[PDB]
Amino acid sequence: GEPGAPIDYDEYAEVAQPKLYQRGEGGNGMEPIPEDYLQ
């Protein structure tokens, strides 16, 4: 029941790894969209 996130505004060796593909998986099986959009 504790606040998992503070309720204020951001008045302004180990690296986090984003949940982002790295080995080209985002192109698997993708059906080509109309060429008019590709410009």
Binding site: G4, Q22, M30, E31
Partner: protein, 251 residues
């Protein structure tokens, strides 16, 4: 999404697919917050460790989608980017602090039964909902497991985790601009976001006004669906002041 299920039609009308023009690829999840403003993670457009740096002309946004792969004509719509706004204090070097970016579309998107924006939380709504144990909803087309890819959009409900538990779960420095979510081993159930889901929305339904608010952005994790590890989400509400400075200046 690990341990999710198939989304229902129109269950997530704010889900956007950030899409690479050439090669045609899925880049990231994203969320629709207005007629021409899409929220995503900053590392989807700028991640130097992997030499990622996309400009507005490289990318498109596909709104209203369900299938990951099929071009869904007459239902999905595809918009172009006018400008990208990455948080000025986004730090990719250590812990993806302020992992957030905005994309303004060239032309306002037409809403439908499958294209609809999500709300951003006010101080009152955020305070009552961002509490450990309360469950939000994560959506994406990413990996179904860490150790392959769904045919349609995936949804999983995950609980907010206490900050002390998030801090102790990893050696990486946690900041106040992120929270973590997922089940503990004692809780039995499973679920997580995974690579390909980042930039997508963590949303919560308000018991006050029946609206959906986006509380988080899929940012990072250590593997997917690991006992004692949790996925980390950009804390949208802490950054909401910046989000508004961009939509009021350049709106």
């Amino acid at each position: 999404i690990v341990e999710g299920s198939d989304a229902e039609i129109g269950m997530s009308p704010w889900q956007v697919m950030l899409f690479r023009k050439s090669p045609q690829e899925l880049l990231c999840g994203a969320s629709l917050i207005s007629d021409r403003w899409v929220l995503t993670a900053a590392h989807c457009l700028l991640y130097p460790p992997w030499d990622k740096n996309f400009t507005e002309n490289d990318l498109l946004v596909r709104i209203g989608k369900h299938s990951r792969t099929r071009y869904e004509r007459n239902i999905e719509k595809i918009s172009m980017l006018e400008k990208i706004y990455i948080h000025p204090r986004y730090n990719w070097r250590e812990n993806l602090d302020r992992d957030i970016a905005l994309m303004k579309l060239k032309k306002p998107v037409a809403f439908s039964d499958y294209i609809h924006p999500v709300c951003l939380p006010d101080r009152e709504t955020a305070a009552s909902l961002l509490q450990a144990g309360y469950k939000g909803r994560v959506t994406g087309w990413g990996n179904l497991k860490e150790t392959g890819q769904p045919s349609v959009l995936q949804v999983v409900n995950l609980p907010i985790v206490e900050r002390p538990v998030c801090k102790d779960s990893t050696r990486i420095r946690i900041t106040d601009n992120m929270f973590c979510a997922g089940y503990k081993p004692d809780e039995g159930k499973r679920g997580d976001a995974c690579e390909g889901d980042s930039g997508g929305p963590f949303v919560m339904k308000s018991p006050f006004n029946n609206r959906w608010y986006q509380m988080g952005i899929v940012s990072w994790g250590e593997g997917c669906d690991r006992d004692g590890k949790y996925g980390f989400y950009t804390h949208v509400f802490r950054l909401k002041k910046w989000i508004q400075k961009v939509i009021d200046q350049f709106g």
